[PDB]
């Protein structure tokens, strides 16, 4: 790997610089290098990893959606034939997106998840696994679409099971996991009722535990609670 010659600490330093510069591809490459050193990641370092790849794949997903919409419109009655270019370019973006997802999944499988024993780390990585399978599912249309969806579900479910046993209902990782799994149900699994039930139960159980929190923990938890409420408002 191109980062093999750089010190772990220097990769982490540079990932932080890249974030400040809004250079998210660089940020992700630095963090991939850091993971490949083989040591476990701290909380802060896990956050750097997630932010980097979230921003890279988020841009790819937005571009894919633009291109997919143009492609769909081209396939409507009365649309003039414009050749293979729209499909080709959507495919190009799609392949690059899949590549990023496969990279992240690969880091999780080799060997972040297996080394993660604390609930906070293990849930964080399993949530990521669910998220990147969900991104693969968004673009999947073939023989494997069901298996990709099931991979996302399985990762999310393991993360939910651990989170419910090991973390308080206000824990931001638990909350963010539930938020995203709820979106999986609504957008990927064709299960809007499950999505709504999860979001509501998660919100309500968090509400009941806010009294235990410091001001700073309260801020963190309530931020994600508001995202749950925002989705519920969208869906009801």
């Amino acid at each position: 790997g191109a980062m093999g010659s750089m010190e772990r600490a220097s990769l982490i330093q540079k990932a932080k610089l890249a974030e400040q510069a809004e250079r998210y591809e660089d940020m992700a490459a630095f963090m991939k290098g850091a993971v490949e050193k083989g040591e476990e990641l701290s909380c802060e370092e896990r956050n750097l990893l997630s932010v980097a790849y979230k921003n890279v794949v988020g841009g790819q997903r937005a571009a894919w959606r633009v291109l997919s919409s143009i492609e769909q419109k081209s396939n409507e009655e009365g649309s003039e034939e414009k050749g293979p270019e729209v499909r080709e370019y959507r495919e190009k973006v799609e392949t690059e997106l899949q590549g990023v997802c496969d990279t992240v999944l690969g880091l999780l499988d080799s060997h972040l998840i297996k080394e993660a024993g604390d609930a906070e780390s293990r849930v964080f990585y399993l949530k990521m696994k669910g998220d990147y399978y969900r991104y693969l599912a968004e673009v999947a249309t073939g023989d494997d679409k069901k298996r990709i969806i099931d991979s996302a579900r399985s990762a999310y479910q393991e993360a939910m099971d651990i989170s419910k046993k090991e973390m308080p209902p206000t824990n931001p990782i638990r909350l963010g996991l539930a938020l995203n799994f709820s979106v999986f149900h609504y957008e990927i699994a064709n299960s809007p009722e499950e999505a709504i039930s999860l979001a509501k139960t998660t919100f309500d159980e968090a509400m009941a535990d806010l009294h235990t929190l410091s001001e700073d923990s309260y801020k963190d938890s309530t931020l994600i609670m508001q995202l749950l409420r925002d989705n519920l408002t969208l869906w009801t």
């Binding site: 963010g176 938020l179 995203n180 979106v183 609504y186 994600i224 995202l227 925002d230 989705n231 869906w235």
Partner: peptide
């Protein structure tokens, strides 16, 4: 699109 984190 719905919110995720």
């Amino acid at each position: 699109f719905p919110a995720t984190v």
